[PDB]
Amino acid sequence: ADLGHQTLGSNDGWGAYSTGTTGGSKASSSNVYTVSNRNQLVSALGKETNTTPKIIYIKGTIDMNVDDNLKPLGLNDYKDPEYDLDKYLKAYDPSTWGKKEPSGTQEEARARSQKNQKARVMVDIPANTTIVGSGTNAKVVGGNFQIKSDNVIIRNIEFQDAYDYFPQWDPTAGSSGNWASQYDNITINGGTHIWIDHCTFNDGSRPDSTSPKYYGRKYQHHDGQTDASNGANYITMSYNYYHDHDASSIFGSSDSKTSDDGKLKITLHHNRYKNIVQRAPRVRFGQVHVYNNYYEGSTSSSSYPFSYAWGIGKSSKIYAQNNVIDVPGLSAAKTISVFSGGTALYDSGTLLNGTQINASAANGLSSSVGWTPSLHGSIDASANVKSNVINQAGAGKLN
Numbered sequence: 564a565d566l567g568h569q570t571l572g573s574n575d576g577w578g579a580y581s582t583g584t585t586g587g588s589k590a591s592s593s594n595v596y597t598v599s600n601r602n603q604l605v606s607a608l609g610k611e612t613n614t615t616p617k618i619i620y621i622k623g624t625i626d627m628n629v630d631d632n633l634k635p636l637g638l639n640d641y642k643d644p645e646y647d648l649d650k651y652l653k654a655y656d657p658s659t660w661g662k663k664e665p666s667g668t669q670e671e672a673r674a675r676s677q678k679n680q681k682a683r684v685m686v687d688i689p690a691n692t693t694i695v696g697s698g699t700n701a702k703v704v705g706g707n708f709q710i711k712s713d714n715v716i717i718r719n720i721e722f723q724d725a726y727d728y729f730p731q732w733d734p735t736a737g738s739s740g741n742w743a744s745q746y747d748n749i750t751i752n753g754g755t756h757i758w759i760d761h762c763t764f765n766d767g768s769r770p771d772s773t774s775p776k777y778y779g780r781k782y783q784h785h786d787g788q789t790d791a792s793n794g795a796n797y798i799t800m801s802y803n804y805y806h807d808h809d810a811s812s813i814f815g816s817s818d819s820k821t822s823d824d825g826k827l828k829i830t831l832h833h834n835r836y837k838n839i840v841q842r843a844p845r846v847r848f849g850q851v852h853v854y855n856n857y858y859e860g861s862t863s864s865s866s867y868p869f870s871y872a873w874g875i876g877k878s879s880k881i882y883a884q885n886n887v888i889d890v891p892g893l894s895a896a897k898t899i900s901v902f903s904g905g906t907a908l909y910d911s912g913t914l915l916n917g918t919q920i921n922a923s924a925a926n927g928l929s930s931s932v933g934w935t936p937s938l939h940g941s942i943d944a945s946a947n948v949k950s951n952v953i954n955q956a957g958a959g960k961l962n
């Protein structure tokens with residue numbers, strides 16, 4: 564079968580659990596579409612009620628920052644009449660505003676401005692849908708796919724530069740405040756039975772090094788690459804190439820969201836993370852199988868310096884098997900970051916710079932996470948992960 568019609572293999576990660584992930588493979592003839600611009604994409608997706616099996620082939624580059632006639636839209640097209648960058652910055656300067664949350668005229672105008680862009684760039688993917696790139700050059704630029712539904716497959720697409728023209732200042736985020744944006748490439752918000760495979764995720768032409776710092780902090784126009792929230796469950800992400808981007812994948816968005824416990828069952832395998840700073844993934848609560856992924860970066864890079872690969876968050880149940888990390892000078896301990904409530908990590912076969920290590924033990928964590936994945940394909944020896952993943956991961960590697 565072609566990529567439009569294949570389904571997730573019955574053993575291929577948590578996505579294969581229960582009813583599995585077949586997307587739109589059974590689409591009838593009038594529910595197969597080929598799309599090459601936002602209008603055609605939006606028409607094919609339709610609304611939440613469009614749950615019949617459907618297959619959507621993306622042909623070429625689809626820019627999501629465009630109007631209904633496909634004219635490109637930028638900052639001045641989205642700006643609320645009352646929003647102004649220089650006045651926003653003057654209003655919320657910690658020097659005069661202090662550390663309270665921004666509120667009042669400019670913040671309200673900024674919020675409305677951001678909703679103006681969201682209406683163009685964010686689209687929901689309805690149940691029983693397969694979306695795949697045709698050829699080696701299918702691209703989604705500036706878009707944020709959101710998946711709240713069940714049974715969805717996304718493959719062979721290069722997602723670039725989910726860019727927010729209106730980052731919000733938050734003085735209380737982190738030790739010194741941070742600017743925050745809204746758009747991921749893909750957000751799984753309660754979505755279930757999802758396969759993301761052979762896609763590429765990067766920051767396109769606007770990497771973070773082209774953004775200035777305001778109040779000493781990077782004016783961050785990006786957010787995540789593939790994030791999962793709000794009881795998202797039964798998901799396989801395989802053979803994806805994440806590169807040149809700060810925060811990759813947060814699974815479980817909040818310590819208070821205890822309803823995520825027993826959910827966020829996600830398998831990550833054969834993904835490549837190059838020049839990714841952090842959160843690859845950062846997990847709360849979930850049983851997440853992480854195996855045969857390759858991570859490569861430098862702690863001294865000026866653009867996207869490595870901070871950590873796996874985030875051991877509250878009650879996370881990461882099961883790591885035969886992953887390979889190549890970051891010169893990094894210690895075994897610093898391959899991961901442990902956050903409050905994170906106490907356990909199964910860690911087997913990890914190579915760091917060519918040497919076998921145990922990040923879990925080095926961080927004092929419990930060596931068992933109370934589960935063993937049954938749904939997986941073949942396990943590569945760690946010695947072969949780098950080569951297999953560089954050769955095979957990302958869009959345009961099949962076609």
Ligand SMILES: O=C(O)[C@H]1O[C@H](O[C@@H]2[C@H](O)[C@@H](O)[C@@H](O[C@@H]3[C@H](O)[C@@H](O)[C@@H](O[C@@H]4[C@H](O)[C@@H](O)[C@@H](O[C@@H]5[C@H](O)[C@@H](O)[C@@H](O[C@@H]6[C@H](O)[C@@H](O)[C@@H](O)O[C@@H]6C(=O)O)O[C@@H]5C(=O)O)O[C@@H]4C(=O)O)O[C@@H]3C(=O)O)O[C@@H]2C(=O)O)[C@H](O)[C@@H](O)[C@H]1O
Binds near residue numbers: 736741793845902
């Ligand atoms: O269908 C819709 O479209 C839908 O849209 C709305 O709802 C969405 C969403 O579905 C809701 O659940 C909710 O989302 C809430 C929030 O608005 C959203 O941005 C989000 O984000 C998470 C956290 O809330 C963020 O603060 C943030 O946090 C991360 C870390 O998790 C956090 O620990 C911290 O990290 C620290 C330091 O601060 C950092 O500096 C760094 O060093 O690391 C450490 C660390 O890792 O611990 O801050 C970071 C960060 O800044 O990114 O990001 C989280 C994330 O997953 O991105 O989740 C919120 C929530 O779960 O409540 O609201 C959304 C919204 O759009 O408003 C509509 O409201 C709804 O009607 C619906 O229609």
Ligand SMILES: [Co+2]
Binds near residue numbers: 786
């Ligand atoms: Co996100």
